[PDB]
Amino acid sequence: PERLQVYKCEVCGNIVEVLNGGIGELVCCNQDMKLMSENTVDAAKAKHVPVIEKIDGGYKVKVGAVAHPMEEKHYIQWIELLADDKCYTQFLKPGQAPEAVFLIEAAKVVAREYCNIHGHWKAEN
């Protein structure tokens, strides 16, 4: 595992993010945890690829070009903004907007979002 990677435990539901890398394989509920690699799922990019907008003092992230659903059974669980050595995470729940604002001083950033159904997605400016 490498820092910032997101792993999911099939069946049991746990989802973790790596803070410190290592060689060991993460296991849960009798199987290796699944690496949720960004932009690998066969789903509409229009609703899943994060859109980054530069604002005063930071960035505004929307998921996505077309607003993604935020329903009890299908929503964006969180949005993250990655920069230099920073990982800012904004958790979301059904009924909220698929959007997040991050105040940071970084010219180059990477935005990520995780959909409970369609996986992990990212975009950069």
Name the nearest CA neighbour of 83 among 114, 101, 106: 106
Q: How far apart, in whole angstroms, are the C-alpha atoms of residue 93 and residue 30? A: 29
Q: Does position 124 bind a second copy by CB under 8 A?
A: no
CB of 78 within 8 A of CB of 54?
A: no
CA dihedral 60, 63, 67, 72 (to 10 degrees): -120
115 is in an annotated binding site: yes
Compute the least distance from the CB of residue 9 to a second copy, in Å: 5
Which member of 41, 43, 66, 90 binds a second copy (CB under 8 A)?
A: 90
Which member of 22, 53, 71, 97 binds a second copy (CB under 8 A)?
A: 22
Please, how many CA atoms are within 13 Å of residue 90, restricted to the half-sphere of its CB? Answer: 21
Which member of 35, 65, 77, 106 binds a second copy (CB under 8 A)?
A: 77
The item of a second copy, Ca ion, Fe ion, none sharing an interface with residue 20, based on CB under 5 to 8 Å by kind, is a second copy
120 is in an annotated binding site: no
Cα-flanking dihedrals φ and ψ of residue 105, to 5°? -105, 80
Supply 72's token pair.
């009890």
Compute the least distance from the CB of residue 67 to Ca ion, in Å: 24
User: Which residues sit in the known binding site for Fe cation?
Assistant: 9, 12, 28-29, 48, 68, 74, 115, 118
Contact set with Fe ion (CB under 5 A): 9, 11-12, 14, 24, 28-29, 115, 117-118
